[PDB]
Amino acid sequence: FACKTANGTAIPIGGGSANVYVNLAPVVNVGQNLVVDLSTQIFCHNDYPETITDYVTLQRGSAYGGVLSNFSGTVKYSGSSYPFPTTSETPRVVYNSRTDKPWPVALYLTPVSSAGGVAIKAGSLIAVLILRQTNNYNSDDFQFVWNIYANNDVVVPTGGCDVSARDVTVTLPDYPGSVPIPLTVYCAKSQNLGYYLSGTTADAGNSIFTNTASFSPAQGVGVQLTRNGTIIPANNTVSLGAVGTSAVSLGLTANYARTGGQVTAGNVQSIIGVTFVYQ
Amino acid sequence: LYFNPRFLADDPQAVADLSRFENGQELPPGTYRVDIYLNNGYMATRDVTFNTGDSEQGIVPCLTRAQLASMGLNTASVAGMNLLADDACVPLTTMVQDATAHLDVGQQRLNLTIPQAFMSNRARGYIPPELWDPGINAGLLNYNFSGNSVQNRIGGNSHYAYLNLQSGLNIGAWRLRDNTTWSYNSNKWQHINTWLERDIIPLRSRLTLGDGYTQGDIFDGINFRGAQLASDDNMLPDSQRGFAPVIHGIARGTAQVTIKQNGYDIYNSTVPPGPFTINDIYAAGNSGDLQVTIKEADGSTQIFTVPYSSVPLLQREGHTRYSITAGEYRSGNAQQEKPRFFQSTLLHGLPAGWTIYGGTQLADRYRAFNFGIGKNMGALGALSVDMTQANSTLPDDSQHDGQSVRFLYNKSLNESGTNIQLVGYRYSTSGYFNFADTTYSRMYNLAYNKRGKLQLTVTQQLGRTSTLYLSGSHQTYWGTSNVDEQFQAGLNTAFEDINWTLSYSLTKNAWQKGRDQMLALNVNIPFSHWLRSDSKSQWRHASASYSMSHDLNGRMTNLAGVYGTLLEDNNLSYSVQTGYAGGGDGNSGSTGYATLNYRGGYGNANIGYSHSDDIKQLYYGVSGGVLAHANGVTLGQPLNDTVVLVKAPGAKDAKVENQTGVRTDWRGYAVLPYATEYRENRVALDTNTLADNVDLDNAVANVVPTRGAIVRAEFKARVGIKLLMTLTHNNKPLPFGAMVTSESSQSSGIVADNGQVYLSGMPLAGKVQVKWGEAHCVANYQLPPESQQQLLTQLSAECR
Amino acid sequence: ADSTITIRGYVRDNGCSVAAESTNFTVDLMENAAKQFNNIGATTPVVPFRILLSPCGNAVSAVKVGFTGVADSHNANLLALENTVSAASGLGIQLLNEQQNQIPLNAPSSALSWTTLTPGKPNTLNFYARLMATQVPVTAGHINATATFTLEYQ
Amino acid sequence: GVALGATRVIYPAGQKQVQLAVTNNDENSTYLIQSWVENADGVKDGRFIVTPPLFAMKGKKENTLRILDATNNQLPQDRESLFWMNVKAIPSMDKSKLTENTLQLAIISRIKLYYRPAKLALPPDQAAEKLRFRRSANSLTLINPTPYYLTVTELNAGTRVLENALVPPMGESTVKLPSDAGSNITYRTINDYGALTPKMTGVME
């Protein structure tokens, strides 16, 4: 029995080793299904199909890399389903034709619940399958070591989540005033997350942000941000807890604060940036 | 309360219409229909029937005893409240001393003032259950569609497609949800979840029937199908969810108490003489210790420090949380068997910041008990220890007994130092098996069970901005010697706006051999401080990202990109980056990715091009949600659980404020994509963007939705014209302040001067009635049809 | 910079809050009846009416104080009382500043002079009253007078 | 008694309404406020409309009067018009105490409302830069060629200090310059919001 691949690599009689590269799905989210079709990669034929019948089956299969670290699943062979990575001998396949035929082997791999980042790196071996070939004419047995590798990188969708109302404004009522600002953040994948505020400051404590108005700024007053009735200094990560599909409210309120001496009038304006930090 | 008409004008006749404003102007009608504001705080608006009696206006507005109790009044604090029947009128004027009630028909204000003694103490931010709106009877669908056209050097004819559908119903208080997925490759269906949920408000619990998952706080989070009754902290008040020690104190007199932390005030109040216990302090977490300062009237001050530390498995004093789940077990793997299991977990709080918790798990082939105590040591920190006993049986029908012990430690050393986050140690014996491994197969990763697990988390602060995160996980096994290791370190800094982050990760799996290292650096530079404030710059909000990676094995990867917005209201976002890879496996080239996603009033749409050395794929995706209710079917952005149905018949293209392009649909309806659960939600429309011929009655609405519910936000609009009428009577101007009411609509106005009257929301033609004393005129006015184009209309009409 | 919040809002310089002090008449036709001449009145309606300006603003420097009301037919420089059955004929109210200088009633805006004001501190302005008449007999009874003082800001 | 929110209220052309705060301090009394707009010449022209033209107030809380636009674009576009907004406050009295003879005054406050046409040439902040002065034999004439209404005060020419005056755009305002006045003249202008801009010195044209 002689086995060949799409490339120049081939398995001669008496067994041997060969490497085959397969391009898998490049985009797969959480709970997605990955299919690796080894049938369209290796074709085997019988050396003496006229009188010798070959029995070819997958003896064992070992997963390598992210396939054994960030995925699992099943292996389909002639309709039979076995584990992946495999631990049992696959069903025997009878080959008695001179013409080469595809190997009826495929892999259905699903990522683990901790999927994230590049699941399988391109240019690295994905699995190694050792197949035992036997014939009824004699007791000769051959071992074929097929190294299935990946040519295109596959990155599981970790999940990039944005904040509602980018570039959102608010207005204070008069000098004595207080206004909550609407800012809700949601993420499709539950994870720990925090937010910290940045901007220009006025005092040493980094509490009151400076007034950067252009049309006669009112000196002696600035804008403060409070969460749950508490002053939030700039550059101070605040734990938002575990945020899931249901959006959580940041719960920030805009207030006034005193910076200098005499209080002028006419305009205040402060630019505040917010930035998220994961873990 | 009499006003001299000579002040208003020098004319001897002047106007008698000031007589309506001289006294309290009591409304003769019983149905006041005025919003009630108790203790200067608005509660709700409803039709209130006023009964004749000894009142300031002569009519006492009848209020239900249950309604008063829900508003904040205490039945026990006022004598005679329990004696009166539920349907009997509550005489707050007589039964409650120093109670003032006033009605204003013009302002539609029901001003109620009651003493603070009659009101019971409540936690900050408490919302009465009455204001919680269960929702409306409506369907809901959410569709997401993604597609790929990846092309490679060999076999590049590939086209993948994913279609996720989420259906749901909100019949009454019951909520039903279902999920489905379609996968297309170059047409296999799939099924994920079916479930229903109900909120038991009196028990403050949730009942879930169908598929679901249990909390992983005590036992491993597992996926089940059956009935779950769980207590949630969402229904609790905002200032009472989490862990916060109860503070007791002795006050000599009417003193002022201030508790602060991290150099900032966290709470303050006034305390009458005697003993006071406070438990409304917010869940600080691990910010640091608390400082309590009490200032007496005489000036004496007492200051003391109370430690603060919270392990995740802690509860507030005098609080309980339970979770029971019963039914079949669905692992997600077709090989695993599906048995029946019943799990019940409970956590309870004891004074001096103690917690006790216990969990039971029963099945046909599994029996597990767990009992643990979480003690808040204080200055040292907080620690929780639990011990679990299991009597399991492997698929080979062999019984196995096992024990496990878990230690969790937390501390808050932010007082001139760094505060650790979690130190966890789990130790299991040779025969302790979790519920997952019991049903692997009928008649395998069960060869080795977890023996020792160590988790370490450290957060260090350098300067004001520099932060260092350290995480470490170490896992052993019984029999074998391979150890799983996961280490992560990270430095985060920011000079003014530029963000620097440097990460170093080490990974060593159990079955795999060889440790893998990953050192990455990322720099973010916003293109805002480098440019002046120009309205039409078109380059604002853009930023550049620099990423560098190193596997330490000889592979270099670099990425440089710019991202920003290119639309008027930031409805569009673009991000273009170019990469460069070399070494390692040998593959090298110039990577590139250009993505563009637009969020609109119909549905999000994203298009992305990726170019590499030999791989190129095109992402095209569209996502959107649809809501079906009694009034019709409205499209919109993907509805994220709680959603508010903005209703405004009359405003066609009105835009919701403080939202990313959420515009009203063609009929005027709209759906808010993200809404906060169990909290006050404010919805406001930009009146500037509203039609010039339509004026909104109110531009701000408040709604408090429950989770998984749809809440209507009413917004009434008037499409009438604004008119400046010059009414004359007997060839003379009308008196000052004569009240004019339109018969066609509900509009009304007051005479300004020289017989001029301003009316809003008036039709092209119609009749009005103006009265000042004891209906003097009934006038009519017809205008040309072309007057609708004009913003303002001025005309004159007499009376008979 | 995932999202930027632009806080905005103006602060306005508040004006001066003024509350007039009601002037009560308690002559009871004592001096007016004794005179019975009405040539220069009887100075019965004499009182130090005080107007308190507090709390004022930060930029309020100078304001204009004027008077206006119903001018007496008999004397153009005096304000007549409100006509009534019990109204005292031959009696009208006249006002003068702290320097005992009569302030014309219903005077033009440009006629009045600027009055200084201490910024940021409470202030009180005291003006004297007097009774005037030209030719009429005293009728005693109640006396009602209506007048308004204009506080023109800068 | 009644405190006005702002001493100066501005009105830009093309806008619909403007808001003015009114607060009460004498919580023990009830004050009724009526508002009206008046032309510079003194006539009661109804070119501006106040939506709550007359209403009472009890206790101590703040209300927001509203000003509309009813000019129909019938005003010059090269100059900002001037109007007077008047708020008249009338107090209350006890019914029993009304028998006793007494005289009660009324609170009326006047403020300047500027109707500013859109598309202004000179910058509103930089409008104070332009100023011209002419010294006569016994008087001083100030002329402001800028298309803005400039209010000047603290006019101190030398040791003597001239009385404050208001100048109109495209015109000259004359004041009585003292005989013993100095050469240099110091003036302080008032901006739109009411803040006191720093002092500046000018030269004769």
Residue numbers in the entry:
A (entry chain H): 1 to 279
B (entry chain D): 2 to 187, 196 to 452, 474 to 804, 808 to 833
C (entry chain F): 1 to 154
D (entry chain C): 1 to 205
Article, verbatim:
Type 1 pili expressed by uropathogenic Escherichia coli (UPEC) are tipped by an adhesin, FimH, that binds mannosylated glycoproteins, including those on the surface of bladder epithelial cells to facilitate attachment to and invasion of bladder superficial facet cells. At the usher, the Nte on an incoming subunit displaces the chaperone’s G1 β-strand and completes the subunit fold of the preceding subunit in a canonical (antiparallel) and energetically favored manner, termed donor-strand exchange (DSE). These structures also show that the two-domain adhesin FimH, which consists of the lectin (FimHL) and pilin (FimHP) domains, adopts an elongated (“relaxed”) or bent (“tense”) configuration prior to and after secretion to the extracellular surface, respectively.
Here, we report the cryo-EM structure of a quaternary complex FimD–FimCFH, in which the FimH adhesin is in a previously unseen location within the pore of the FimD usher during transport. Unlike the previously determined initiation and elongation structures, this complex reveals FimH positioned halfway in the usher pore. Thus, we termed this conformation “relaxed-stretched. This conformation is adopted by FimH as it spans the entire OM while retaining contact with both the periplasmic and extracellular spaces. In this model, FimH is linked to FimF through DSE between FimH and FimF. The chaperone–subunit complex FimC–FimF makes contacts with both the CTDs and N-terminal tail of the usher FimD. With the engagement of only two pilin subunits (FimH and FimF), the FimHP domain is partially inserted into the TD pore as FimF, having undergone DSE with FimHP, remains bound to the chaperone FimC and held by the usher NTD and CTDs in the periplasmic space.
